Design a protein around this ligand. Structure first.
Ligand SMILES: Nc1ncnc2c1ncn2[C@@H]1O[C@H](COP(=O)(O)OP(=O)(O)OP(=O)(O)O)[C@@H](O)[C@H]1O
Ligand SMILES: Nc1ncnc2c1ncn2[C@@H]1O[C@H](COP(=O)(O)OP(=O)(O)OP(=O)(O)O)[C@@H](O)[C@H]1O
Ligand SMILES: Nc1ncnc2c1ncn2[C@@H]1O[C@H](COP(=O)(O)OP(=O)(O)OP(=O)(O)O)[C@@H](O)[C@H]1O
Ligand SMILES: Nc1ncnc2c1ncn2[C@@H]1O[C@H](COP(=O)(O)OP(=O)(O)OP(=O)(O)O)[C@@H](O)[C@H]1O
Ligand SMILES: [Mg+2]
Ligand SMILES: [Mg+2]
Ligand SMILES: [Mg+2]
Ligand SMILES: [Mg+2]
Ligand SMILES: [Zn+2]
Ligand SMILES: [Zn+2]
Ligand SMILES: [Zn+2]
Ligand SMILES: [Zn+2]
Lengths: 332, 338, 338, 338
């Protein structure tokens, strides 16, 4: 078999040796001689080569070459030549760097179906990422119409779209960006649990709809019954939220873990979130990544068994545990 | 003077007492009696009311009312009624929650001019947040045309836009979303340090251009000499990066914390790096662009401290991980020690 | 204005009269009549009372009541009633009596701690112990600096670490454990080993650096040089075998710095012996040094009592009953700060 | 017949001569030539060497060598070669250098600890800190006695406990936490509140009891009387507000016991004031008392150095640099042990 150097591999002289790779998998090789040999080895795989052929070309001791080849291979700095090959080419570099076959990942995305339940801030941003990453079918669910105030966060919408159906404009704008995918709309506000039967089975549901307060509870109980994976995303004012990502039988579910009354109920009935496009976009982006990773199967979604928050007025990411509980009211 | 309960405040009975507020400002008050007083007081300011007028309707001691009033006012859960007097409505709740007068914040955004240096994935997402938040003038700078591969992250672009100038298409799409603002383009590629004088002065530069490796170093040197604020944003493969936000005389600069000697290794390094293409991913791009844009809005708006002052911040995407690189002022810096 | 008796006040019959207070503030009152007058005055303040209301309650002459009131007030045995704040959450409730006993309003001390940043430079034996005291006392932002992984031998004193944690990064496990203990604060990490002086620019500004990193032997001299130049407060803590050491607490422009009071056939032999040095670590010694270090930090930021280690290197013996202090006052002939 | 230089040995040129050793054993040798000779001699024992083998590599007269050998041996700067015969990988290896420096064979000290049993009577701030030190130094059996559950307020000092632990038995969580740190030892619990002297019979025989339970006030008096009658060694530790306190360490027939050196109107006022007493807790003070308590336990059982609190109650101040010992020497007169 042939191997090839990933284009995502950068090399830098640093400290007593140097760096190989960039991002999460960046390696610090302290020993300069080892680092120089890794360079000599990587050089042989810029164009695809078998191990024996590169061994000849590199002209360093076989034991050293074997060391360097192994190091490059384990970190997916060099990859099976078969994994090399296109509109998705940049995403391919991503899948490659996790040690996946991008063609198999792309095929999984192409054959997947994603429900977007809620086509507001989060729906807009999640739906574009998924569509342009080649998710084969996207179903858009909302009964609301576009308003001028939506435009701060709802990136697919224009001034001219005010008054039109949310699902209609998303579908239009999605197809402008990737005409290879199929998009559906369902004009549907979930008023009671039974309405969830109108939401089709899919690989995963992206749930950002937020009214009423126990919508997420209905969705959860429904999806546990239906063996339907879903992921929740949103915000609480300045905090971006994504997760949990519920996987039937594998992860925990959402549930696992008086004249004062009319005053609290009144105050809470008037609540409107004080939030911010950047907050919205962070939640949606990380939600979309967990969806791609879940369907593509190349890396573990972050929000399995977790509800993750990202703060905007300080530097902070924190997770609330949503691990499985054998005493759970809904699952088990 | 009237005060009013912000609509972004919510309350929950919790533990021994309860929670007041949502998000980063949320307060847990363990004492039941005190929590119950804070909500009763909050309730009196649902309609815009002076302290005395609200107190008239309350049925708790005057001294408890004051304590609670003080608590609410300090956390910006109640605000001057004038602050609540529009496309930017949702943004207004945000500003209010930081104790700011949203009309004054909005006017500062209206009077602002922002340079978008680099109109790729970062520049796409930043420019549209800025435009729809009412930044008054935006200047688009790039010399590249759209390619089909751009579409995974460059959210303003359609299939039909392949081959067109990125600046042209961004402008079209921004004015489609906010016709109340001013957008202009400069077809420029920064080739040398000496090209930077061709970039206009602005409230801030959003720098996401990345070619060659030392462009950021030239931008830093120039902006330090020019008294020009800038923010850098981008990614390193799977790591979303924003910062530093350089502010003349206030923060450190990019350089405050600042191939091969063997020829047969050097040329191998150079070829490898010439073939470099980042292994990244819309979610990574979008996180960096979003936090960048938040820092621009806060820097201009003045209502909250931008996160990337004195910091280059990385957000990992395959782990729960955020780390900061120190970019505080060095009194020995070879660029900003004026 | 109400006054209230501190709960930390202790009274006992002793000698010819009695003792008032416990700890550093304990006072032997030989005169029985004045001792009895002190307790009669104190008795009026168990529940909060004004000077005048209490004056009428006491069976003692105005003259004697005045003397006894001032006695109690000046020793902070009675404190302003507002300092009691009985209805605080409270995570930190236990610490309040300590602040009260020094005449401070605990809620104001608590606020200073919440608004502080502390860098822990070195996340070993000393770092474990200091960081946890600081986190649970409510220092608002803690920055963990180290590049080392946990080893089984670390477990004798690196209290936050479990057998299960061997192999993991020290900063990551400390962060995890600190947030399990106090979810209300912020913790961050920097994967960094100071290899030369210039790596110190990678350590951010904070209210104070807690320095227990010890490799190489002159790391402390680099740190000192940097902090003087950077106007950065720091406290050093560690041990010399069986003696626990904390201090100096360097304060820019207030204290001396670390350097202020500073053949042929031998040199190679001296170098060799010293290059082999390993401290005789012993948890009790480590823990004492870390504890008193942490006290000086809390007091430095809290401002309610003088840190012990201002202008001083303090050693506590473990095989003798002994504490000795080494002067580290300013020198005009100092090569670093003179 | 081999000797080896201690790894804990350091030297420095100082004054007219130099320093040898670090910690309590540091010696200043004013004579340059003598100091130089000690270095040359110490150098000869870096590798494990007999007196004769080392002397053959020394470039100094045998009389000078003999005297330097004697100085090094007396101070345990050089130790028997076999005392260094364990793995650097032994979990207790750091403690081993500590034992070496006191002239003990670390394997034998460790054997004594492995076979010891220690009762922890009181699982609050002191018991938390003592128990982990003892667990991770290799005390073979630890018995935890308390009847309280974990509260939010505990977390300031109670280092083994976390927010999630609230509501759980103190002893259950300590056990879990101790075994996570050292799975090579045995840890038991007894749910017991000592309500009267008669309850002390339910506390197991052990090598020593660590006593930090504090309620009622005469609990120490009960413990002392029982232990004297039951021939049971015990150490007391705690605090009196800002003063850390450890001792006495009672050893049947070898030390004094606790009681050795010991209108109705104001009487009732005294009682109510004292009934109201709550210590001004502060983690640094707690941890100091616990650390030195633990040191005394390890030395009592290890037998390599004298526990400090034999015949003494020792106070360490926190707001001044001060350590003081109250005599608790044996009295023939004593009503309890006399
Ligand atoms: N029960 C529900 N069924 C279907 N869609 C829902 C339900 N509840 C909420 N949604 C939709 O989910 C989306 C939530 O997104 P978002 O709140 O950003 O939009 P919005 O409500 O128009 O904006 P704003 O709250 O600022 O007016 C909305 O489009 C809303 O119509
Ligand atoms: N020196 C420079 N001067 C001006 N613009 C620049 C310079 N270097 C880079 N840019 C621009 O900054 C943007 C970088 O964004 P990005 O890399 O996401 O886009 P891209 O290059 O089209 O995509 P890809 O890197 O996937 O090919 C590009 O539009 C590029 O043209
Ligand atoms: N120059 C340096 N930069 C950063 N961290 C350092 C430096 N020198 C020492 N440290 C860190 O400071 C800590 C010192 O603590 P300590 O010596 O108790 O731990 P240790 O070195 O792991 O243990 P031992 O000395 O018993 O092997 C270590 O965690 C070490 O990694
Ligand atoms: N008579 C007794 N019998 C058994 N255990 C006791 C007795 N008296 C006290 N204790 C225990 O000894 C410990 C004393 O330690 P400490 O006072 O630090 O703990 P705490 O009471 O949890 O802390 P705080 O008093 O600050 O709330 C407590 O855990 C307490 O339950
Ligand atoms: Mg909505
Ligand atoms: Mg590019
Ligand atoms: Mg060390
Ligand atoms: Mg207690
Ligand atoms: Zn469940
Ligand atoms: Zn600079
Ligand atoms: Zn000095
Ligand atoms: Zn006695």
């Amino acid at each position: 078999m042939d191997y090839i150097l990933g284009r995502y591999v950068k090399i830098a002289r640093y400290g007593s040796g140097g760096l190989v790779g960039g991002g999460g998998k960046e390696q610090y090789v302290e020993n300069l001689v080892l680092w120089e040999n890794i360079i000599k080895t990587a050089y042989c795989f810029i164009t695809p080569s078998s191990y024996t052929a590169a061994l000849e070309t590199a002209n360093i001791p076989e034991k050293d070459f074997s060391n360097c080849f192994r190091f490059l291979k384990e970190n997916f700095f060099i990859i099976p030549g078969e994994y090399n090959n296109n509109r998705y080419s940049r995403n391919f570099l991503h899948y490659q760097s996790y040690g996946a076959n991008p063609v198999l990942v792309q095929d999984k995305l192409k054959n997947a179906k994603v429900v977007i339940l809620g086509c507001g801030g989060i729906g807009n941003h999640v739906s574009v990422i998924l569509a342009t990453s080649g998710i084969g079918e996207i179903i858009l669910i909302d009964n609301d119409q576009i308003e001028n105030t939506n435009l701060t966060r709802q990136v697919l919408f224009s001034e001219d779209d005010v008054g039109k159906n949310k699902t209609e404009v998303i579908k239009r704008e999605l197809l402008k960006r990737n005409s290879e995918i199929s998009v559906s709309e369902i004009a549907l506000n979930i008023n009671d649990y039974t309405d969830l039967h109108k939401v089709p089975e899919a690989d995963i549901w992206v749930v950002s709809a937020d009214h009423p307060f126990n919508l997420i509870n209905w969705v959860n109980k429904y999806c546990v019954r239906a063996n339907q994976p879903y992921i929740n995303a949103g915000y609480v004012n300045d905090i971006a939220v994504f997760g949990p990502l519920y996987v039937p039988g594998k992860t925990g579910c959402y549930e696992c873990q008086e004249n004062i009354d009319h005053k609290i109920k009144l105050i809470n009935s008037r609540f409107k979130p004080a939030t911010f496009a950047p907050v919205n976009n962070v939640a949606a982006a990380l939600c979309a990544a967990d969806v791609i990773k879940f369907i593509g199967k190349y890396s573990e979604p972050l929000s399995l068994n977790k509800r993750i928050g990202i703060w905007s007025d300080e530097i902070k990411i924190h997770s609330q545990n949503m691990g499985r509980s054998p005493v759970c009211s809904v699952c088990g």
